[PDB]
Paper text:
We report cryo-EM structures of the related NiFe-HydABCSL hydrogenase that reversibly oxidizes H2 and couples endergonic reduction of ferredoxin with exergonic reduction of NAD. Here, we report cryo–electron microscopy (cryo-EM) structures of NiFe-HydABCSL determined in a flavin-free apo state, in an “electron bifurcation-ready” (BR) state, and in a “post-electron bifurcation” (PB) state. The structures of the NiFe-enzyme show that none of the previous proposals for the site of bifurcation in [FeFe]-HydABC hydrogenases are likely to be correct and that instead electron bifurcation occurs at a single NAD(H)-binding flavin in combination with a unique arrangement of three iron-sulfur clusters.
To understand the electron transfer pathways in the NiFe-enzyme, we prepared cryo-EM grids in the presence of purified A. mobile Fd, FMN, and NADH. Fd was not resolved in the 3D map, perhaps because Fd binds only transiently. The structure is similar to that of the apo state, but the HydC Fd-like CTD and the HydB NTD, which were well resolved in the flavin-free apo state, became invisible in the high-resolution EM map. It is likely that the FMN and NADH binding caused a series of structural changes leading to the release of HydB NTD and HydC CTD from the main body of the structure and becoming flexible. FMN and NADH had well-defined densities in HydB and are stacked in parallel to each other in a configuration that resembles those in Nqo1 of complex I. Compared to the apo state, all the FMN/NAD-coordinating loops underwent substantial conformational changes to accommodate the two cofactors. The distance between the NAD nicotinamide C4 atom and the ionizable N5 atom in the FMN isoalloxazine ring is only 4.2 Å, well within the hydride transfer range. The FMN isoalloxazine ring is 6.0 Å from the B1 [4Fe-4S] cluster, providing an electron transfer path from FMN and the NiFe site via the chain of five clusters B1-A1-A2-A3-S1. Because it sits at the meeting point of the NiFe-S1-A3-A2-A1-B1 and B5-B4-B3-B2-C1 pathways, the single-flavin FMN must play, at least in part, the role of electron bifurcation. In the active state when both NAD and FMN are bound, we found that HydC CTD becomes mobile and interconverts between a bifurcation-ready BR state where electron transfer from FMN to the C1 [2Fe-2S] is permitted and a post-bifurcation PB state where electron transfer from C1 to B2 [2Fe-2S] is permitted.
Residue numbers in the entry:
A (entry chain C): 4 to 75
B (entry chain E): 1 to 179
C (entry chain A): 1 to 277
D (entry chain D): 4 to 450
The structure:
Amino acid sequence: STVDVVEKVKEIVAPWKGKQGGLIPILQEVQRELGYLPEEALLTISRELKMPKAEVYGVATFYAQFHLKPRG
Amino acid sequence: MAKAKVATFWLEACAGCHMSFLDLDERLIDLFQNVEILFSPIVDAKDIPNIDVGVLSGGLGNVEEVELAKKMRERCKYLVAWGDCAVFGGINCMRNFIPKDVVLREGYIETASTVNPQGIVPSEDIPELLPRALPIDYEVKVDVYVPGCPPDADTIYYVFKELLAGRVPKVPSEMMRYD
Amino acid sequence: MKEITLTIDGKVCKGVQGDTILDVANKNDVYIPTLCYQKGLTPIGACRMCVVQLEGNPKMLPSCTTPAQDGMVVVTKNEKLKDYRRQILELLFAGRNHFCMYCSQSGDCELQRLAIEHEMDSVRFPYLYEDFEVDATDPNLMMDHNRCVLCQRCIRTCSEIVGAHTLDLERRGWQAKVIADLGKRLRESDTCVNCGACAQSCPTGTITIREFAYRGRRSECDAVVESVCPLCAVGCKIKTYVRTGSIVRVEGTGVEEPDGGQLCHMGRWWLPESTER
Amino acid sequence: VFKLEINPVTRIEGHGKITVMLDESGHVRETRFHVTQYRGFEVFTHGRDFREMPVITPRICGICPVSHHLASAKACDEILGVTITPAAHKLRELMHMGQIVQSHALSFFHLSSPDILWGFDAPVKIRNVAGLVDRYPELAKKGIMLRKFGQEIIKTLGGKKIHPWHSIPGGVNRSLTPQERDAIAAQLPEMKSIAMEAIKLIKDYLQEGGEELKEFATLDTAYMGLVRDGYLELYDGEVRIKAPRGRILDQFDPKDYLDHIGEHVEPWSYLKFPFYKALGFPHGSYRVGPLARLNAADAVSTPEASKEFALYKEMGEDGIVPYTLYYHYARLIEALYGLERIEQLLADPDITSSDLRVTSKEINPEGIGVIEAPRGTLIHHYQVNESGVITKVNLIVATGHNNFAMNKGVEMVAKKYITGTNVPEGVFNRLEHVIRAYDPCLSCSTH
Ligand code: SF4
Ligand code: SF4
Ligand code: SF4
Ligand code: SF4
Ligand code: SF4
Ligand code: FCO
Ligand code: FES
Ligand code: 3NI
């Protein structure tokens, strides 16, 4: 559910608020627990870390390990 | 008897470059006294003769233009590309992002004011469109490039005077324009 | 010392120990080709057109990011550098789809001027005919990615000067692209203030103000007058361009002040829209 | 059993190919005129902003770029829902008159005059503008000067001679100044004299070989034109179709063209066949161009062109001249008209005006621009979305209307002058002159 991922990634970004770094590990752990990075996950990561959406989408699509669509 | 043998043609042009050749108004009259014009879009010769300066305009979109460019290349020693359509590919290359089938179909079936419930596309007695429109430097070997859309009259006249004087010219940077 | 001296093109130039070579060159008059350099933004180093070499050292150094050091001789024009710069321009033209015939910036584009100054009359490369998106969803700004040099001066202007970090780079490699928030079109992005600082920063004709297309070319103006924006209290300095009794373009002078030349939607949309009432 | 191909037809604009199919006994049974180029301006313009169209569409042809410029300007004007300042109207009409003058001068002097002066049986190497300036130098320089006048008007208004830029969506970019206005106005006498000289030449040519030149590719069809209240208009007006005998059939408003005109597609040509829908194909097909214009229009608005319009009207019945080779004559009349029209525009103190733009903030989903290009009627039709992005484009250009007339004329001269095989290069030249009378812009047709 698109509402489950909201709180579920809230609990993954919790240990990282206000620590000056560690965004690619956040994305790594959202990839581990979802297999892909949905748009809702990225929007909530941006709203919690108060990092712009352009930055999180740029770093999410920079690496080949991540995926923006559900994988087979 | 000491006249040159300029021979010109257009492949996939809009006639713009030949009309910019035709606006050398008095320069045209004083150039005809130094150039005899064999096969050309404004003369009635049907086949290309052995020439000295061959001039091509437009790109390559059909299977006829490729063969005509190859003929003009074999029949001349100095080839001159006129316009961005021959030098860069030009506005024709705007259709290189849509497949040929979709171009012909949406241009002859899907347009308004078109009535053909059969679904005919023009496919007989006429050359077939290439999959991609390309510049002339894909099938021939160009000697002088004249970029523009269309090139100015002064540039065409400069290239003519330089080639009929015996030197292969390069369009100077103060008169080069891509329009 | 804080007072160094170099020799660019044989001409002796003065400067300060902290600047780069391009700054010492621009400080006197000296010319160096640049495409990704913008006064007021931290040097990026992407186009590699500002390359320059010293006597003795065969290496090539980017004049915009390498610091100046007293005693070095700088050579800006020779056969090698002309060849390399022409190859870079031909790569840029063969990679993307540049149609100068109908470009809105077809007489004031930095790439086109650099191509004409280097006597580019062929691309020498197989002309990759790739399909790039043209984003005209926003009624005011248009982003035609067929004309992108990927200089990132739009991503640096919406980040350090504006703050509305709406632009960034999508997938790496040759598939690099300038996107809005989360890959959306500019009209779907909510973090945009419609300031047009990106249109002023773009050197090519990718980002373009739509309603003044083909009229707001700085090359075909009649007069340039600098004044102040009356609409609000900030009072931003402007660079009004006049053509046939009409304001065709308002650009923000002040790329040295903290504003950075970014004007508000009003300053660069209402003021040229006011002269046609 | 076999075939004759004149391809490529010369001294016309574009790529054409006439094919005659002879039977076993050596007689003509079928003849076609194929257009062999296509680029896809209706297709590759999707996704572009509409303000980009007045610059892309002139690249359809370099003989009439001002016509496509102005039609695209009108279409974008109706997309913006703006009704342009009287000054912009007059400047657009001045540029259109310059284009008419230059196109008719080119199509009479540089492309068809050898067959008018030397005949259809002249040698091949001398039948061109080079041989013309060699033997008739005064006439060649006269035509050159007339085309120079037209294209210098186009240049002073729009910056360049070919593919100019003057007309923005909403109005016009530049205005004339007294200096250049008087510089243009002081050149009109010799241009009128050149037009009258050409009119004399063509009238004596047609009266010399009087009646045989009246059966040359003559077929009774309908005539389409643009008209004001009753007057010949080239910029604005209503579309009027006249039956082959004078009766007006479906005079309508340009924007209602999808209800009256349809294009039939044939497999052997990239050119379509527009026709009046209520009569179908190939019965609803009509003619466009100078002849059809002067047949559909009832009067003209300039003195020295009316004095010749009367002489033209008293050549055929019902105020209708169906003869194909009279096109040339009609064409010159238009050129004359154009010159005189300029003399009325330059005398209006709103040509040097300053109110030239009507900018608005409104995007309507449809815009139709219909004008009178030198060879006939030109219709642009743009369909955009709310963002101003082009969704659909439809073009119907002048020579495309004249395709059926060209085919029928070519077939007539084919089974009138081709006796058998061993066809000399004087019968092929007539098979090309039936095309050259309409003076086709084959790049406009297959946009
Ligand atoms: S470059 Fe321009 S003027 Fe020349 S043929 Fe192509 S479209 Fe026509
Ligand atoms: S951005 Fe510059 S180089 Fe590219 S098409 Fe436009 S004018 Fe030409
Ligand atoms: S309009 Fe302003 S906020 Fe929007 S992308 Fe451009 S610079 Fe950034
Ligand atoms: S849009 Fe313009 S400023 Fe941004 S990267 Fe592309 S060329 Fe550079
Ligand atoms: S440009 Fe905008 S912010 Fe600057 S002074 Fe004018 S109204 Fe104020
Ligand atoms: N003449 C012409 Fe071109 C055509 N047909 C236009 O408009
Ligand atoms: S301009 Fe010096 S590296 Fe980009
Ligand atoms: Ni035409």
